[PDB]
Amino acid sequence: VVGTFKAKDLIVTPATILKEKPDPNNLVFGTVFTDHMLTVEWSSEFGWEKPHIKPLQNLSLHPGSSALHYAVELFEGLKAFRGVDNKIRLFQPNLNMDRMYRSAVRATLPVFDKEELLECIQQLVKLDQEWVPYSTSASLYIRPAFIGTEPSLGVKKPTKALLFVLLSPVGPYFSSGTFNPVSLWANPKYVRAWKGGTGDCKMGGNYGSSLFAQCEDVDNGCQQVLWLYGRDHQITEVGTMNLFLYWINEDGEEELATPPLDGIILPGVTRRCILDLAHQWGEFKVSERYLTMDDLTTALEGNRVREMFSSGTACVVCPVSDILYKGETIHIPTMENGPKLASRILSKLTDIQYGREESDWTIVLS
Amino acid sequence: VVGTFKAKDLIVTPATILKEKPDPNNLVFGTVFTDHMLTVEWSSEFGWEKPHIKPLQNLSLHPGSSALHYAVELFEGLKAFRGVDNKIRLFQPNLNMDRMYRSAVRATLPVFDKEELLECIQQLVKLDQEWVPYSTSASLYIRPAFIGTEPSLGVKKPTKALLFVLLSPVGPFNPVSLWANPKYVRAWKGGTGDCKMGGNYGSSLFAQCEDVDNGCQQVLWLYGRDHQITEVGTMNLFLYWINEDGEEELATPPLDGIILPGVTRRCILDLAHQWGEFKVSERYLTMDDLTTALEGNRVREMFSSGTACVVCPVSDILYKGETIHIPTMENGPKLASRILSKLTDIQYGREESDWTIVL
Numbered sequence: 001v002v003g004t005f006k007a008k009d010l011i012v013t014p015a016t017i018l019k020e021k022p023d024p025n026n027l028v029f030g031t032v033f034t035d036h037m038l039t040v041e042w043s044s045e046f047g048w049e050k051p052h053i054k055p056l057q058n059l060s061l062h063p064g065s066s067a068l069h070y071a072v073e074l075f076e077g078l079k080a081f082r083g084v085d086n087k088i089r090l091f092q093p094n095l096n097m098d099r100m101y102r103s104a105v106r107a108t109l110p111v112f113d114k115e116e117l118l119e120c121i122q123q124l125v126k127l128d129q130e131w132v133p134y135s136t137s138a139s140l141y142i143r144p145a146f147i148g149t150e151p152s153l154g155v156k157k158p159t160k161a162l163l164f165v166l167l168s169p170v171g172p173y174f175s176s177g178t179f180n181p182v183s184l185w186a187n188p189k190y191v192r193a194w195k196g197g198t199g200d201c202k203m204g205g206n207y208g209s210s211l212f213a214q215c216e217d218v219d220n221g222c223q224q225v226l227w228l229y230g231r232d233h234q235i236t237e238v239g240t241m242n243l244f245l246y247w248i249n250e251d252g253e254e255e256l257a258t259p260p261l262d263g264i265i266l267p268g269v270t271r272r273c274i275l276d277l278a279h280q281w282g283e284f285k286v287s288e289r290y291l292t293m294d295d296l297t298t299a300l301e302g303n304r305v306r307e308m309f310s311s312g313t314a315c316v317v318c319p320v321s322d323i324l325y326k327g328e329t330i331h332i333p334t335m336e337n338g339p340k341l342a343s344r345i346l347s348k349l350t351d352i353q354y355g356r357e358e359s360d361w362t363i364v365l366s
Numbered sequence: 367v368v369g370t371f372k373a374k375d376l377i378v379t380p381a382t383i384l385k386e387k388p389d390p391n392n393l394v395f396g397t398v399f400t401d402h403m404l405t406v407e408w409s410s411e412f413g414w415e416k417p418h419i420k421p422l423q424n425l426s427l428h429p430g431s432s433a434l435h436y437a438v439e440l441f442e443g444l445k446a447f448r449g450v451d452n453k454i455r456l457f458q459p460n461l462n463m464d465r466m467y468r469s470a471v472r473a474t475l476p477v478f479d480k481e482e483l484l485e486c487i488q489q490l491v492k493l494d495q496e497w498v499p500y501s502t503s504a505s506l507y508i509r510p511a512f513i514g515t516e517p518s519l520g521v522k523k524p525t526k527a528l529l530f531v532l533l534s535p536v537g538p539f540n541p542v543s544l545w546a547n548p549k550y551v552r553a554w555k556g557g558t559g560d561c562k563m564g565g566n567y568g569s570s571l572f573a574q575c576e577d578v579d580n581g582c583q584q585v586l587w588l589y590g591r592d593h594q595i596t597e598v599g600t601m602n603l604f605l606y607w608i609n610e611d612g613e614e615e616l617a618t619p620p621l622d623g624i625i626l627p628g629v630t631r632r633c634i635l636d637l638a639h640q641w642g643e644f645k646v647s648e649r650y651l652t653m654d655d656l657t658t659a660l661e662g663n664r665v666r667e668m669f670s671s672g673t674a675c676v677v678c679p680v681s682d683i684l685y686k687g688e689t690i691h692i693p694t695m696e697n698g699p700k701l702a703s704r705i706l707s708k709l710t711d712i713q714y715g716r717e718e719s720d721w722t723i724v725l
């Protein structure tokens with residue numbers, strides 16, 4: 001009956017015991033959780049139930065829940081930042097609501113009002129706002145999660161669902177003053193996503209398949225997987241991050257390149273922001289364009305590569321120093337070239353996030 | 367540290383209040399559950415905990431559990447059958463243990479002893495014996511499920527996992543129409559399509575809804591530039607036809623990475639090989655192969671195979687705005703019904719085969 005839950009209807013149950021906050025200089029990503037969570041029930045029969053902010057607790061799930069059997073699930077990732085002026089800000093959160101809604105449609109999970117969800121998240125962050133780290137390098141990670149809770153074993157659109165939101169303090173990925181570059185494991189035997197698949201959505205199924213390649217990656221002394229696609233060996237994504245290459249292209253032009261949104265690339269918020277920034281600066285060519293391993297190695301051979309970095313919410317920007325490919329270690333001169341652009345981008349994005357630069361990209365906490 | 371759980375140290379906690387069994391005449395597939403369940407806990411620090419048979423209950427899961435975020439999960443599907451002689455039988459259950467083990471490796475979930483799990487399952491079915499329907503048209507569906515319960519949001523190999531088993535009384539030609547849209551691809555080479563990992567299935571619900579929107583019951587999964595016909599929903603695809611050489615042939619797509627190696631598929635192949643009445647070919651089949659054969663009146667039957675239906679005749683394919691009729695039902699379907707009869711006879715103990723194990 002009810003098309004969406006409403007922030008107006010929020011039922012809040014404060015915790016009676018409050019946990020001590022962690023040292024912001026000693027945070028490991030996604031391991032410590034705050035006092036409270038958002039939960040909202042849905043059923044086909046009654047529609048959306050009233051949303052609850054309540055103490056962080058285990059989920060009680062029928063063991064037949066479709067999220068556990070057929071990966072009927074999706075997530076988001078966005079952050080709250082305590083500013084230089086001690087104001088807490090969200091960064092481009094409407095883009096995450098847009099993406100989550102679209103992933104829900106693709107998953108066949110129930111549709112919701114994006115502004116109502118945004119306001120419920122605002123209220124949850126406001127309640128746990130002291131968990132937003134008092135550090136200009138740490139932030140509060142927000143994990144909205146949407147699962148099918150259909151008890152029956154038929155492979156079908158769920159008639160029961162749970163939307164929930166977790167909060168987790170996260171620290172810097174740089175340390176001792178500098179970036180921590182990654183080595184990438186490039187094995188064309190694995191594919192992250194395919195044309196006709198769901199790689200342009202944040203559905204859980206895209207990620208469970210990537211764990212094997214990641215373990216093999218770690219066994220070979222690499223931190224992330226470089227995801228290759230097709231007979232041409234297109235470079236697509238770095239782990240769970242978008243791929244950027246800053247180089248002199250085939251025409252001899254200084255260029256920032258990233259793979260196009262042709263269905264196998266997750267449309268990152270960070271990725272969009274970087275494209276926007278680089279276009280605005282107007283200092284070099286910006287291309288959404290295919291990039292192969294042969295393109296890369298040829299350019300490296302002729303000293304045309306400047307930097308390679310990955311982009312995502314957790315780290316904003318992550319420089320790439322090495323790629324393990326066909327039994328060889330190929331060096332990327334990212335760190336030797338500054339990294340000039342990667343550092344410039346990180347500074348710009350963090351300025352905005354922490355309120356050093358006024359931009360419409362941020363929103364002050366409700 | 368503990369490499370496997372063992373059926374030896376099974377802890378059995380029977381329910382004090384038992385539920386009434388459903389009418390075996392009106393069962394809805396996976397909607398009704400028995401009194402008990404198996405659960406086995408794992409962690410990287412201590413290895414496999416002791417297994418438990420206990421009352422069916424909700425799972426208490428950390429909201430960060432990787433099964434909920436990154437689909438760190440797999441399942442199996444197999445059945446128990448109350449024979450004509452009242453003996454309860456499992457059917458090729460070691461093949462399900464083999465496949466579950468493969469799926470866990472690909473998923474990075476902890477490995478276990480296959481013989482130990484089968485025995486834990488046998489003890490579970492044994493406890494809940496009376497739930498195996500008193501009907502030769504019904505069976506007990508067995509659902510082993512294996513999930514990551516790692517509380518942290520980092521995308522990595524789980525340090526926490528839960529293995530559980532559910533039991534569900536299920537009942538019972540009604541041919542299906544297939545919706546064929548090449549813009550959805552079920553599986554890719556370098557993917558996980560040959561495992562029963564949950565991630566393979568979440569991505570399929572949109573296509574199935576679209577299928578229903580158009581009066582079709584299942585999706586025909588197409589692959590590649592040549593539009594290879596691969597699987598029928600959650601079933602393997604069989605084509606009974608006269609091939610291009612003018613030979614009568616049973617054909618099915620080969621196991622090149624994008625096809626789930628079905629148990630039913632295996633059994634049908636074994637049987638058709640044994641009979642030696644027609645050619646048996648694991649080979650590529652395209653939409654053009656099929657439409658060309660249909661024009662020349664060379665197609666006899668098309669059916670899917672899986673544990674839930676055993677065999678499912680196909681009457682129509684909707685592809686590129688066309689309605690392509692398959693003469694399955696106008697040809698008996700004799701092969702489909704022969705297979706259904708054969709497997710049913712073995713499953714319900716009407717004939718002996720090493721494929722069945724008495725509980």
Ligand SMILES: O=C(NNS(=O)(=O)c1ccccc1C(F)(F)F)c1cc2cc(Cl)ccc2o1
Nearest residue numbers: 077173223240241311312313314315318519520
């Ligand atoms: O930003 C990163 N990931 N992108 S993300 O933030 O949007 C994301 C996407 C999908 C799943 C999980 C994640 C997250 F949160 F990183 F865990 C990321 C991964 C990563 C791995 C290393 Cl080793 C270093 C820096 C890193 O940053």
Ligand SMILES: O=C(NNS(=O)(=O)c1ccccc1C(F)(F)F)c1cc2cc(Cl)ccc2o1
Nearest residue numbers: 153154155443583600601671672673674675678
């Ligand atoms: O046997 C079937 N599916 N194969 S299955 O049995 O191994 C299976 C595989 C993956 C997920 C779920 C299932 C199951 F159990 F059907 F739900 C099946 C699907 C199906 C759909 C229709 Cl419309 C009619 C008969 C049918 O039988």
Ligand SMILES: *Cc1c(COP(=O)(O)O)cnc(C)c1O
Nearest residue numbers: 240241242266268269270312313
């Ligand atoms: C989330 C994600 C991205 C990065 O997206 P952001 O919105 O910038 O955090 C890129 N690739 C994959 C596979 C992702 O899951």
Ligand SMILES: *Cc1c(COP(=O)(O)O)cnc(C)c1O
Nearest residue numbers: 600601602626628629630672673
């Ligand atoms: C399980 C399944 C099959 C059928 O396999 P059986 O072992 O015969 O039940 C076929 N295709 C897919 C995608 C499946 O998951």
